[PDB]
Amino acid sequence: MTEYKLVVVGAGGVGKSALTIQLIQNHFVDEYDPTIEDSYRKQVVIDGETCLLDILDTAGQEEYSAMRDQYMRTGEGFLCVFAINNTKSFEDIHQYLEQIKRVKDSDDVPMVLVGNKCDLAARTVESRQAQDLARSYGIPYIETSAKTRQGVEDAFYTLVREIRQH
Ligand SMILES: Nc1nc2c(ncn2[C@@H]2O[C@H](COP(=O)(O)OP(=O)(O)NP(=O)(O)O)[C@@H](O)[C@H]2O)c(=O)[nH]1
Ligand SMILES: [Ca+2]
Ligand SMILES: [Mg+2]
Ligand SMILES: [Mg+2]
Numbered sequence: 001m002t003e004y005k006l007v008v009v010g011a012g013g014v015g016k017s018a019l020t021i022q023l024i025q026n027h028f029v030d031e032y033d034p035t036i037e038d039s040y041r042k043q044v045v046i047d048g049e050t051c052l053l054d055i056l057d058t059a060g061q062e063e064y065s066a067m068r069d070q071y072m073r074t075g076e077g078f079l080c081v082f083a084i085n086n087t088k089s090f091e092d093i094h095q096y097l098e099q100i101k102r103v104k105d106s107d108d109v110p111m112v113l114v115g116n117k118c119d120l121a122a123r124t125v126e127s128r129q130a131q132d133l134a135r136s137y138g139i140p141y142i143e144t145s146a147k148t149r150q151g152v153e154d155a156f157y158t159l160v161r162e163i164r165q166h
Contacts, residue, residue, distance in 0.1 A: 001043070003052040004160050007075035009096050011089040012060035014081045015116040018146035020057045023156050028147050035059050037067060046157050053160070072103040077110035077163040079155060083117040084143070087124045090133075097137055110162040111139045114155050119145040 008016045017038070018029050024040045038057040043050060056071055058064075072078075078100055082089040093113070100109050113134040115125060127143065134141035140158055144151035 001050050001052050002164075003054060004163050005054050005056070005074065005076040006079060006156065006159055006163075007056040007058060007071055007077070008079045008081060009058050009100075010060055010081035010114075011083075011086070011092040012062075014060065014083040014086065014089050015144075015146045016060065016079075016081050017057050019079070019081065019114070019116060019144060019152060019155070020055055022146045022149055022152050024055070028149075034061055036064060037071070046160055051160060053156070055156075068099060069103055072100050076166075077112075077159045079112055079114055079159050081114045081116050082125065082130075084115045084125045084130075085117055085120050085122045090125045090130065094133065108138075108166070110159065110166050111137065112155055112159045112162065113137075113139055113141045115141065115143040116146060118143040118150060119147050 008020055010016055017035050020040055021029050024042050035057055036059055040055045042053045044053055080093050080096055082093045101107060115130050131141050142151050142155045144155050
């Protein structure tokens with residue numbers, strides 16, 4: 001059984017915890033409890049192989065930025081999340097991509113760019129703007145809604161695939 005170390009990163013409140021908890025426990029967390037650092041594990045079949053998903057749900061609050069170097073060293077693939085109704089979170093995710101590369105000394109780190117909260121109509125980040133950012137890093141872009149489950153499995157299983165094929 002192959003184990004995959006997934007890490008979910010991004011700015012405060014973009015929905016990292018809601019995304020992970022939707023994938024693992026199949027319900028939507030409506031309240032907003034800011035995360036320090038939580039771990040989840042789950043056995044799943046992906047392309048006919050049983051996998052162990054080890055998911056790290058990380059802090060978006062700038063307070064805990066010191067914890068970053070460690071978890072980027074350890075993790076194998078990174079789900080990099082912004083919210084489509086938060087332009088600043090899109091500008092911020094760019095800074096996360098550079099840190100992952102820097103910390104891991106590699107321009108080829110398995111990553112997926114995720115535009116979350118796509119159920120909301122107050123969009124300020126157009127899909128094409130995020131596509132352009134993902135293209136310059138050579139990584140996929142997938143929109144999600146933790147609330148409706150749209151794209152949630154697609155995003156996480158795509159990241160597994162990127163790790164697998166690394
Ligand atoms: N409509 C909608 N709301 C969402 C979605 N994802 C998260 N939210 C809401 O946004 C708030 C923040 O979500 P949360 O998962 O805690 O974000 P976070 O990125 O983990 N925050 P932190 O970095 O502080 O730990 C919650 O009220 C949650 O219900 C989504 O896809 N759609
Ligand atoms: Ca709920
Ligand atoms: Mg959280
Ligand atoms: Mg604009």
